[PDB]
PDB file of C-alpha atoms in Angstrom:
ATOM      1  CA  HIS N   1       3.207-133.341 -45.855  1.00  0.00           C
ATOM      2  CA  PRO N   2       7.094-132.773 -45.541  1.00  0.00           C
ATOM      3  CA  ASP N   3       9.371-135.321 -44.493  1.00  0.00           C
ATOM      4  CA  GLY N   4      11.600-133.682 -41.693  1.00  0.00           C
ATOM      5  CA  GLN N   5      11.839-134.820 -38.269  1.00  0.00           C
ATOM      6  CA  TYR N   6      11.170-130.800 -37.319  1.00  0.00           C
ATOM      7  CA  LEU N   7       8.638-128.336 -38.715  1.00  0.00           C
ATOM      8  CA  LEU N   8       8.569-124.508 -38.738  1.00  0.00           C
ATOM      9  CA  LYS N   9       5.644-122.654 -38.596  1.00  0.00           C
ATOM     10  CA  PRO N  10       5.629-118.660 -38.649  1.00  0.00           C
ATOM     11  CA  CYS N  11       4.798-116.993 -35.886  1.00  0.00           C
ATOM     12  CA  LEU N  12       1.337-114.924 -36.706  1.00  0.00           C
ATOM     13  CA  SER N  13       0.853-113.119 -33.360  1.00  0.00           C
ATOM     14  CA  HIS N  14       2.918-112.984 -29.290  1.00  0.00           C
ATOM     15  CA  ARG N  15      -0.530-114.653 -28.276  1.00  0.00           C
ATOM     16  CA  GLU N  16       0.770-117.631 -29.849  1.00  0.00           C
ATOM     17  CA  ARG N  17       4.630-117.553 -29.306  1.00  0.00           C
ATOM     18  CA  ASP N  18       3.707-116.940 -25.407  1.00  0.00           C
ATOM     19  CA  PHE N  19       1.582-119.982 -25.391  1.00  0.00           C
ATOM     20  CA  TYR N  20       4.203-122.235 -26.386  1.00  0.00           C
ATOM     21  CA  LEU N  21       7.039-119.879 -23.968  1.00  0.00           C
ATOM     22  CA  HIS N  22       4.838-120.761 -21.037  1.00  0.00           C
ATOM     23  CA  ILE N  23       4.110-123.871 -21.268  1.00  0.00           C
ATOM     24  CA  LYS N  24       7.704-125.555 -22.632  1.00  0.00           C
ATOM     25  CA  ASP N  25       9.044-125.906 -19.522  1.00  0.00           C
ATOM     26  CA  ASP N  26       5.850-127.609 -17.937  1.00  0.00           C
ATOM     27  CA  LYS N  27       5.741-131.022 -16.930  1.00  0.00           C
ATOM     28  CA  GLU N  28       1.953-130.961 -17.080  1.00  0.00           C
ATOM     29  CA  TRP N  29       1.327-130.194 -20.593  1.00  0.00           C
ATOM     30  CA  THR N  30       5.151-131.676 -22.095  1.00  0.00           C
ATOM     31  CA  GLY N  31       4.896-134.665 -19.516  1.00  0.00           C
ATOM     32  CA  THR N  32       2.187-135.545 -20.094  1.00  0.00           C
ATOM     33  CA  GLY N  33       2.469-135.819 -24.190  1.00  0.00           C
ATOM     34  CA  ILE N  34      -1.001-133.473 -24.336  1.00  0.00           C
ATOM     35  CA  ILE N  35       0.696-131.208 -26.953  1.00  0.00           C
ATOM     36  CA  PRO N  36       3.973-131.452 -29.618  1.00  0.00           C
ATOM     37  CA  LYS N  37       6.946-131.050 -28.757  1.00  0.00           C
ATOM     38  CA  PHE N  38       7.834-127.165 -29.104  1.00  0.00           C
ATOM     39  CA  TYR N  39      11.882-126.661 -29.846  1.00  0.00           C
ATOM     40  CA  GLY N  40      12.027-123.371 -29.848  1.00  0.00           C
ATOM     41  CA  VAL N  41      11.652-119.946 -31.562  1.00  0.00           C
ATOM     42  CA  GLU N  42      13.895-119.151 -34.353  1.00  0.00           C
ATOM     43  CA  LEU N  43      14.624-116.458 -36.214  1.00  0.00           C
ATOM     44  CA  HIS N  44      14.401-116.404 -40.509  1.00  0.00           C
ATOM     45  CA  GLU N  45      15.129-113.749 -42.897  1.00  0.00           C
ATOM     46  CA  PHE N  46      11.773-112.209 -44.183  1.00  0.00           C
ATOM     47  CA  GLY N  47      12.956-108.675 -46.135  1.00  0.00           C
ATOM     48  CA  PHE N  48      15.182-106.316 -44.795  1.00  0.00           C
ATOM     49  CA  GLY N  49      14.657-108.386 -40.938  1.00  0.00           C
ATOM     50  CA  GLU N  50      13.730-111.090 -39.188  1.00  0.00           C
ATOM     51  CA  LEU N  51      10.322-113.205 -38.598  1.00  0.00           C
ATOM     52  CA  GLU N  52      10.085-115.528 -35.671  1.00  0.00           C
ATOM     53  CA  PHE N  53       9.622-119.085 -36.340  1.00  0.00           C
ATOM     54  CA  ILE N  54       8.101-121.840 -34.397  1.00  0.00           C
ATOM     55  CA  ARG N  55       9.740-125.123 -34.225  1.00  0.00           C
ATOM     56  CA  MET N  56       7.838-128.279 -33.354  1.00  0.00           C
ATOM     57  CA  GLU N  57       8.136-131.828 -33.590  1.00  0.00           C
ATOM     58  CA  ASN N  58       6.590-133.352 -36.983  1.00  0.00           C
ATOM     59  CA  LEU N  59       4.380-135.925 -35.616  1.00  0.00           C
ATOM     60  CA  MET N  60       3.985-137.663 -38.713  1.00  0.00           C
ATOM     61  CA  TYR N  61       8.185-138.351 -38.862  1.00  0.00           C
ATOM     62  CA  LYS N  62       8.284-141.675 -41.008  1.00  0.00           C
ATOM     63  CA  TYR N  63       4.781-142.183 -41.253  1.00  0.00           C
ATOM     64  CA  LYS N  64       4.491-144.592 -44.852  1.00  0.00           C
ATOM     65  CA  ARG N  65       0.579-144.419 -44.900  1.00  0.00           C
ATOM     66  CA  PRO N  66      -0.680-141.088 -42.540  1.00  0.00           C
ATOM     67  CA  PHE N  67      -3.958-140.985 -41.421  1.00  0.00           C
ATOM     68  CA  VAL N  68      -5.177-137.620 -39.971  1.00  0.00           C
ATOM     69  CA  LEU N  69      -8.267-136.496 -38.607  1.00  0.00           C
ATOM     70  CA  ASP N  70      -8.451-132.443 -37.348  1.00  0.00           C
ATOM     71  CA  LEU N  71     -11.593-131.447 -34.713  1.00  0.00           C
ATOM     72  CA  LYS N  72     -12.250-128.333 -33.442  1.00  0.00           C
ATOM     73  CA  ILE N  73     -12.703-127.918 -29.973  1.00  0.00           C
ATOM     74  CA  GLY N  74     -15.055-125.536 -28.565  1.00  0.00           C
ATOM     75  CA  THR N  75     -18.711-123.908 -28.632  1.00  0.00           C
ATOM     76  CA  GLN N  76     -16.954-120.827 -30.851  1.00  0.00           C
ATOM     77  CA  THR N  77     -14.339-120.234 -32.393  1.00  0.00           C
ATOM     78  CA  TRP N  78     -14.525-116.345 -32.384  1.00  0.00           C
ATOM     79  CA  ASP N  79     -13.086-114.738 -29.004  1.00  0.00           C
ATOM     80  CA  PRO N  80     -12.710-110.875 -27.961  1.00  0.00           C
ATOM     81  CA  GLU N  81      -9.999-110.318 -30.879  1.00  0.00           C
ATOM     82  CA  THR N  82     -12.011-111.592 -33.785  1.00  0.00           C
ATOM     83  CA  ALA N  83     -12.139-109.074 -36.657  1.00  0.00           C
ATOM     84  CA  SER N  84     -15.602-107.961 -36.851  1.00  0.00           C
ATOM     85  CA  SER N  85     -15.767-108.203 -40.699  1.00  0.00           C
ATOM     86  CA  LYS N  86     -14.542-112.062 -39.962  1.00  0.00           C
ATOM     87  CA  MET N  87     -17.924-112.112 -37.526  1.00  0.00           C
ATOM     88  CA  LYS N  88     -20.614-113.513 -39.710  1.00  0.00           C
ATOM     89  CA  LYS N  89     -18.561-116.380 -40.897  1.00  0.00           C
ATOM     90  CA  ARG N  90     -17.522-117.652 -37.580  1.00  0.00           C
ATOM     91  CA  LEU N  91     -20.960-117.808 -36.156  1.00  0.00           C
ATOM     92  CA  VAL N  92     -22.666-119.404 -39.386  1.00  0.00           C
ATOM     93  CA  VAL N  93     -20.176-122.172 -39.181  1.00  0.00           C
ATOM     94  CA  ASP N  94     -20.202-122.723 -35.653  1.00  0.00           C
ATOM     95  CA  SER N  95     -23.695-123.064 -35.461  1.00  0.00           C
ATOM     96  CA  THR N  96     -24.622-124.767 -38.697  1.00  0.00           C
ATOM     97  CA  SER N  97     -22.122-127.442 -37.871  1.00  0.00           C
ATOM     98  CA  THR N  98     -21.944-129.135 -34.369  1.00  0.00           C
ATOM     99  CA  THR N  99     -19.529-127.059 -32.765  1.00  0.00           C
ATOM    100  CA  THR N 100     -22.576-125.119 -30.489  1.00  0.00           C
ATOM    101  CA  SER N 101     -24.709-128.563 -29.962  1.00  0.00           C
ATOM    102  CA  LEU N 102     -21.197-130.554 -29.263  1.00  0.00           C
ATOM    103  CA  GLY N 103     -18.445-128.321 -28.417  1.00  0.00           C
ATOM    104  CA  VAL N 104     -16.550-129.890 -31.489  1.00  0.00           C
ATOM    105  CA  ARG N 105     -16.270-130.315 -35.183  1.00  0.00           C
ATOM    106  CA  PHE N 106     -15.208-131.762 -38.231  1.00  0.00           C
ATOM    107  CA  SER N 107     -12.249-129.460 -39.377  1.00  0.00           C
ATOM    108  CA  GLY N 108     -10.016-132.244 -42.487  1.00  0.00           C
ATOM    109  CA  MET N 109      -9.381-135.391 -42.830  1.00  0.00           C
ATOM    110  CA  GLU N 110      -6.588-137.843 -44.831  1.00  0.00           C
ATOM    111  CA  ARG N 111      -7.003-141.508 -45.174  1.00  0.00           C
ATOM    112  CA  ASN N 112      -4.224-143.324 -47.408  1.00  0.00           C
ATOM    113  CA  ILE N 113      -5.640-146.738 -48.038  1.00  0.00           C
ATOM    114  CA  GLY N 114      -3.307-147.818 -50.440  1.00  0.00           C
ATOM    115  CA  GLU N 115      -4.247-146.223 -53.254  1.00  0.00           C
ATOM    116  CA  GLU N 116      -2.760-142.300 -54.380  1.00  0.00           C
ATOM    117  CA  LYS N 117      -2.905-139.903 -53.498  1.00  0.00           C
ATOM    118  CA  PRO N 118      -4.344-140.074 -50.194  1.00  0.00           C
ATOM    119  CA  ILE N 119      -8.075-139.445 -49.831  1.00  0.00           C
ATOM    120  CA  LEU N 120      -9.005-136.109 -48.690  1.00  0.00           C
ATOM    121  CA  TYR N 121     -12.345-135.278 -46.764  1.00  0.00           C
ATOM    122  CA  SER N 122     -12.745-131.369 -46.630  1.00  0.00           C
ATOM    123  CA  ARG N 123     -13.268-129.160 -43.410  1.00  0.00           C
ATOM    124  CA  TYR N 124     -15.894-127.550 -44.889  1.00  0.00           C
ATOM    125  CA  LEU N 125     -18.188-131.122 -45.211  1.00  0.00           C
ATOM    126  CA  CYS N 126     -18.401-129.650 -41.322  1.00  0.00           C
ATOM    127  CA  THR N 127     -21.772-127.722 -42.128  1.00  0.00           C
ATOM    128  CA  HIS N 128     -23.948-130.716 -43.886  1.00  0.00           C
ATOM    129  CA  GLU N 129     -22.413-133.817 -44.501  1.00  0.00           C
ATOM    130  CA  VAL N 130     -21.256-133.991 -40.997  1.00  0.00           C
ATOM    131  CA  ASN N 131     -23.381-131.422 -39.564  1.00  0.00           C
ATOM    132  CA  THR N 132     -24.688-134.092 -36.376  1.00  0.00           C
ATOM    133  CA  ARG N 133     -23.303-135.984 -33.744  1.00  0.00           C
ATOM    134  CA  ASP N 134     -24.150-139.712 -35.668  1.00  0.00           C
ATOM    135  CA  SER N 135     -21.935-138.394 -38.598  1.00  0.00           C
ATOM    136  CA  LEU N 136     -18.760-136.687 -36.661  1.00  0.00           C
ATOM    137  CA  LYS N 137     -19.343-140.024 -35.142  1.00  0.00           C
ATOM    138  CA  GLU N 138     -19.370-142.121 -38.004  1.00  0.00           C
ATOM    139  CA  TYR N 139     -16.575-139.688 -39.915  1.00  0.00           C
ATOM    140  CA  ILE N 140     -14.251-140.671 -36.898  1.00  0.00           C
ATOM    141  CA  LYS N 141     -15.147-144.259 -37.317  1.00  0.00           C
ATOM    142  CA  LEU N 142     -14.307-143.711 -40.786  1.00  0.00           C
ATOM    143  CA  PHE N 143     -10.562-142.450 -39.811  1.00  0.00           C
ATOM    144  CA  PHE N 144     -10.194-145.748 -38.003  1.00  0.00           C
ATOM    145  CA  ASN N 145     -10.691-147.982 -40.894  1.00  0.00           C
ATOM    146  CA  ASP N 146      -7.424-148.555 -42.801  1.00  0.00           C
ATOM    147  CA  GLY N 147      -9.878-149.803 -45.351  1.00  0.00           C
ATOM    148  CA  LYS N 148      -8.611-153.391 -44.454  1.00  0.00           C
ATOM    149  CA  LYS N 149     -10.015-153.276 -41.293  1.00  0.00           C
ATOM    150  CA  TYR N 150     -11.351-150.743 -38.067  1.00  0.00           C
ATOM    151  CA  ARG N 151      -8.197-150.241 -35.789  1.00  0.00           C
ATOM    152  CA  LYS N 152      -9.959-150.738 -32.572  1.00  0.00           C
ATOM    153  CA  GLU N 153      -6.674-151.393 -30.653  1.00  0.00           C
ATOM    154  CA  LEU N 154      -6.020-147.701 -31.364  1.00  0.00           C
ATOM    155  CA  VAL N 155      -9.424-145.840 -29.551  1.00  0.00           C
ATOM    156  CA  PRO N 156      -8.136-146.541 -26.084  1.00  0.00           C
ATOM    157  CA  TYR N 157      -4.651-144.603 -26.858  1.00  0.00           C
ATOM    158  CA  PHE N 158      -7.102-141.743 -28.154  1.00  0.00           C
ATOM    159  CA  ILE N 159      -9.603-141.479 -25.249  1.00  0.00           C
ATOM    160  CA  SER N 160      -6.467-142.259 -22.842  1.00  0.00           C
ATOM    161  CA  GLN N 161      -5.218-139.144 -24.511  1.00  0.00           C
ATOM    162  CA  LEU N 162      -8.351-137.257 -24.222  1.00  0.00           C
ATOM    163  CA  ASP N 163      -8.696-138.053 -20.158  1.00  0.00           C
ATOM    164  CA  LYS N 164      -5.659-135.937 -20.019  1.00  0.00           C
ATOM    165  CA  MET N 165      -6.643-133.322 -21.816  1.00  0.00           C
ATOM    166  CA  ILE N 166      -9.635-133.022 -19.765  1.00  0.00           C
ATOM    167  CA  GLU N 167      -7.647-133.166 -16.402  1.00  0.00           C
ATOM    168  CA  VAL N 168      -5.217-130.435 -17.743  1.00  0.00           C
ATOM    169  CA  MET N 169      -7.810-127.945 -19.050  1.00  0.00           C
ATOM    170  CA  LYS N 170     -10.384-128.742 -16.103  1.00  0.00           C
ATOM    171  CA  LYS N 171      -7.233-126.072 -13.935  1.00  0.00           C
ATOM    172  CA  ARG N 172      -8.627-123.612 -16.013  1.00  0.00           C
ATOM    173  CA  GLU N 173      -5.619-122.033 -16.595  1.00  0.00           C
ATOM    174  CA  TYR N 174      -6.354-120.933 -20.637  1.00  0.00           C
ATOM    175  CA  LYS N 175      -9.261-120.106 -22.342  1.00  0.00           C
ATOM    176  CA  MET N 176      -8.375-121.887 -25.936  1.00  0.00           C
ATOM    177  CA  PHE N 177     -10.659-120.468 -28.854  1.00  0.00           C
ATOM    178  CA  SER N 178      -9.795-122.459 -32.544  1.00  0.00           C
ATOM    179  CA  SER N 179      -7.772-125.119 -31.020  1.00  0.00           C
ATOM    180  CA  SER N 180      -7.664-128.699 -32.282  1.00  0.00           C
ATOM    181  CA  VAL N 181      -7.649-132.384 -31.341  1.00  0.00           C
ATOM    182  CA  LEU N 182      -5.102-134.075 -33.809  1.00  0.00           C
ATOM    183  CA  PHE N 183      -5.946-137.608 -34.497  1.00  0.00           C
ATOM    184  CA  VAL N 184      -2.983-139.321 -36.369  1.00  0.00           C
ATOM    185  CA  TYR N 185      -1.751-142.273 -36.855  1.00  0.00           C
ATOM    186  CA  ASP N 186       0.442-144.939 -39.181  1.00  0.00           C
ATOM    187  CA  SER N 187      -1.681-147.611 -40.741  1.00  0.00           C
ATOM    188  CA  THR N 188       1.060-149.461 -41.257  1.00  0.00           C
ATOM    189  CA  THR N 189       1.996-149.408 -37.044  1.00  0.00           C
ATOM    190  CA  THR N 190       1.862-152.081 -34.525  1.00  0.00           C
ATOM    191  CA  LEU N 191       1.082-151.396 -31.020  1.00  0.00           C
ATOM    192  CA  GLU N 192       4.575-151.734 -29.903  1.00  0.00           C
ATOM    193  CA  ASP N 193       5.926-149.214 -33.090  1.00  0.00           C
ATOM    194  CA  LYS N 194       3.897-146.081 -31.511  1.00  0.00           C
ATOM    195  CA  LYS N 195       3.293-144.383 -35.033  1.00  0.00           C
ATOM    196  CA  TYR N 196      -0.134-142.874 -33.713  1.00  0.00           C
ATOM    197  CA  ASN N 197      -0.811-140.067 -31.636  1.00  0.00           C
ATOM    198  CA  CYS N 198      -3.252-137.661 -30.440  1.00  0.00           C
ATOM    199  CA  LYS N 199      -2.368-134.032 -29.265  1.00  0.00           C
ATOM    200  CA  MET N 200      -4.088-130.609 -28.834  1.00  0.00           C
ATOM    201  CA  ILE N 201      -3.112-127.700 -31.226  1.00  0.00           C
ATOM    202  CA  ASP N 202      -3.346-124.429 -32.670  1.00  0.00           C
ATOM    203  CA  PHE N 203      -3.197-121.762 -29.902  1.00  0.00           C
ATOM    204  CA  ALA N 204      -2.561-118.567 -31.682  1.00  0.00           C
ATOM    205  CA  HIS N 205      -5.774-117.485 -29.858  1.00  0.00           C
ATOM    206  CA  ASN N 206      -4.932-119.176 -26.274  1.00  0.00           C
ATOM    207  CA  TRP N 207      -5.613-117.000 -23.639  1.00  0.00           C
ATOM    208  CA  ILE N 208      -3.685-117.016 -19.913  1.00  0.00           C
ATOM    209  CA  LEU N 209      -6.510-115.765 -17.432  1.00  0.00           C
ATOM    210  CA  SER N 210      -3.893-115.014 -14.187  1.00  0.00           C
ATOM    211  CA  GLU N 211      -2.068-112.750 -17.128  1.00  0.00           C
ATOM    212  CA  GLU N 212      -4.948-111.048 -19.017  1.00  0.00           C
ATOM    213  CA  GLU N 213      -8.913-111.126 -19.106  1.00  0.00           C
ATOM    214  CA  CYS N 214     -11.454-113.425 -21.042  1.00  0.00           C
ATOM    215  CA  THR N 215     -14.840-112.684 -20.372  1.00  0.00           C
ATOM    216  CA  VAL N 216     -16.494-115.100 -23.219  1.00  0.00           C
ATOM    217  CA  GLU N 217     -16.764-118.825 -22.307  1.00  0.00           C
ATOM    218  CA  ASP N 218     -14.779-121.137 -24.507  1.00  0.00           C
ATOM    219  CA  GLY N 219     -16.568-124.470 -24.250  1.00  0.00           C
ATOM    220  CA  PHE N 220     -13.639-126.389 -24.588  1.00  0.00           C
ATOM    221  CA  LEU N 221     -14.170-128.756 -21.131  1.00  0.00           C
ATOM    222  CA  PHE N 222     -17.739-129.378 -22.793  1.00  0.00           C
ATOM    223  CA  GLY N 223     -16.143-130.118 -25.710  1.00  0.00           C
ATOM    224  CA  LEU N 224     -13.569-132.899 -24.707  1.00  0.00           C
ATOM    225  CA  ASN N 225     -16.275-134.275 -22.919  1.00  0.00           C
ATOM    226  CA  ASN N 226     -18.468-134.805 -25.897  1.00  0.00           C
ATOM    227  CA  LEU N 227     -15.021-136.193 -27.890  1.00  0.00           C
ATOM    228  CA  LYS N 228     -14.675-138.350 -25.364  1.00  0.00           C
ATOM    229  CA  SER N 229     -18.173-139.878 -24.891  1.00  0.00           C
ATOM    230  CA  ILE N 230     -18.415-140.333 -28.952  1.00  0.00           C
ATOM    231  CA  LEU N 231     -15.094-142.156 -28.604  1.00  0.00           C
ATOM    232  CA  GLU N 232     -17.100-144.507 -26.052  1.00  0.00           C
ATOM    233  CA  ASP N 233     -19.690-145.233 -28.018  1.00  0.00           C
ATOM    234  CA  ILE N 234     -16.960-146.318 -30.997  1.00  0.00           C
ATOM    235  CA  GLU N 235     -15.312-148.522 -28.483  1.00  0.00           C
ATOM    236  CA  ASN N 236     -18.244-150.165 -27.586  1.00  0.00           C
ATOM    237  CA  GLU N 237     -19.383-150.558 -31.183  1.00  0.00           C
ATOM    238  CA  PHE N 238     -16.380-152.156 -32.450  1.00  0.00           C
ATOM    239  CA  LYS N 239     -16.392-154.488 -29.921  1.00  0.00           C
ATOM    240  CA  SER N 240     -18.971-156.624 -32.002  1.00  0.00           C
ATOM    241  CA  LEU N 241     -16.439-156.747 -34.845  1.00  0.00           C
TER     242      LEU N 241
END
């Protein structure tokens, strides 16, 4: 993980660029803190011309011991622009993971428990080892295990973030395919340090419904509520701890 305050990601399409430029201003997205702060689209040398890069905050700036969990949200991760040659793999991963059943699946995790290097949990565990609600819930509990203790004081923050995501997406302004909800914290944090975060990311396949049409359904809201419901169960199960 690069340590700079800002990170730069290339623009793969203008579908992604256009989303960030459209909600950059919006108080309901930026003021509510459910997306990473976006600083602009800048140009950088590529060959004999230039390429567009998204500048965004480094959510893990100055994180001493990073914990990261990436969950894909939605009942499908393909959309109308998905190439047909890609579709078998999308269908397989979607159905053998929890994506079609819950609208949320495991996408990768990293834990730093004082023993370098950080323990990496492959995204590809989602089709076997993390392929049910219960195993998903347990892998999220593991995210909250720093190795010394379960960080139960952080869970209400994450639920609060989900509530804010639900409220915004209930508006049904967009459809979003293959987006993630990103969980991070620095295990050396206190509550007061506020070195923890939950943000929606990955907007390359977002659709602005008032500006273009997208017939297929994302199952995004369905996914959020199930994610929310998992975190509440975790909250309850952490009470006797």
